[PDB]
Design a protein around this nucleic acid. Structure first.
Ligand SMILES: Cc1cnc(O)c(C)n1
Ligand SMILES: Cc1cnc(O)c(C)n1
Lengths: 228, 226
DNA sequence: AGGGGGGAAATCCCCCCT
DNA sequence: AGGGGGGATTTCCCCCCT
């Protein structure tokens, strides 16, 4: 089939995420509309023939890291997953996970890079171990407000990753008794009786893949290590 | 631009992930090459016209959960995040996150669902939390047995000894003659340093498939599409 | 807000076994 | 693979102080 039917082409324009491809020079060959608007372009085709340096977004300050990641995918043939935290022309900070894989020509030779970004909230981090543990006994599956202060959010964040009170008190510059007060305030807001129950309720309400706004402070583009 | 160029079509066939779409009845309209192979169809066109019940895969045992999630997307218009744990015709257990969104038509009416799955059995992104801590100033060859890998996985996700013992069906004393051996071959002096070191060796990406023993298809969350 | 006392319970990590 | 003993050190969660 040298052609896609028109309904399949509608899938092309509707797939989720922020994605496209670049050639061996990391100059854009195609970007979808989602990525175009995220990077500040009403017409996603204006990305074509631009590099990451030439885009009207604060992400251009990280263009070198993107290209370094692209060169690694191109030379090694391995695919990678990148954590990205940046401010965007819409005025807010966003965290993404960008998958990067070799883009191959009609005969298998590498001709560039394919990127695919997902918003962090469409990904799973701590909910993975939360549910692997639940496979002992039997649970049930049925899907279904609350406001936290800046420090309440940071403490919850560190709790869900298993950081102990001695660790949390050191990294936040406060007393261990101060942390206990925040665990109590969090235990109250979630309607939890114990700390272990607080962890459970918070993971069920999505906090396992939430980075609190107060920690979207510095631009970052790191390749997360995998074992091939 | 009512036509894609042929190189834009090459991107369509190579886009990463396991994805495709289904109509209002959850009958497969399209499935990409990666998904067809994951399910057991060497040629993905064979997916078309089938439902989740009719796939040559043990995942067909959860087809009703799939269609339930499908109907929820059709009903609400939300995007839905599903955790999936299943055995597949390649003889292995896998852990995927499938994202499901409405599939719309020319006038915007919902005509089915789009699924998009990513394998994280060996590409888990746990290290995200560690990277956020370091960048914000809130932080400071190996061969493992199957049982050691389990304990390490549970430590990396912050589980406590009582929790790890209950999960693994052994005593805490045994979950110590394991943390001890992990502390050794990682060269860590404290359980804290073992977590940090292992995270930097990339073990946050691993899900020990010895812990993948029951099929699971559960909705983790959903959200509005702006 | 940030910091604290105190006591039951749990952890951490040394040592010991089949 | 699966178990402990024991003791220094911390959680844990109820009170409480500026
Ligand atoms: C936001 C972002 C991060 N990495 C990339 O490679 C691109 C193209 N965009
Ligand atoms: C493996 C899998 C899980 N959920 C789905 O909806 C599909 C189509 N496949």
């Amino acid at each position: 089939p040298n052609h896609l039917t028109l309904e399949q082409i509608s899938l092309f324009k509707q797939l989720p995420g922020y994605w496209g491809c670049k050639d061996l020079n990391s100059v854009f060959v195609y970007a979808n509309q989602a990525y175009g608007e995220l990077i500040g372009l009403k017409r996603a085709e204006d990305c074509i023939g631009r590099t990451d340096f030439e885009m009207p977004s604060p992400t251009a300050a990280c263009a070198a890291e993107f290209q370094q990641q692209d060169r690694y995918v191109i030379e090694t043939g391995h695919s990678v997953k990148v954590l990205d935290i940046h401010p965007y022309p819409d005025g807010h900070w966003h965290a993404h996970i960008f998958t990067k894989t070799p883009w191959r020509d009609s005969q298998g030779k590498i001709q560039g890079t394919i990127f695919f970004g997902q918003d962090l909230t469409d990904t799973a981090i701590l909910e993975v171990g939360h549910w692997v543990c639940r496979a002992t006994g039997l649970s049930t599956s049925t899907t279904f407000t609350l406001k936290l202060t800046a420090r309440e959010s940071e403490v919850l964040f560190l709790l869900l990753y298993g950081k102990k009170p001695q660790h949390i008190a050191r990294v936040m510059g406060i007393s261990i008794k101060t942390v206990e007060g925040y665990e109590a305030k969090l235990r109250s807001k979630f309607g939890a009786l114990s700390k272990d129950q607080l962890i459970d309720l918070a993971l069920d309400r999505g906090f396992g893949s939430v980075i609190p706004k107060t920690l979207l402070r510095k631009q970052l583009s790191v390749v997360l290590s995998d074992h091939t």
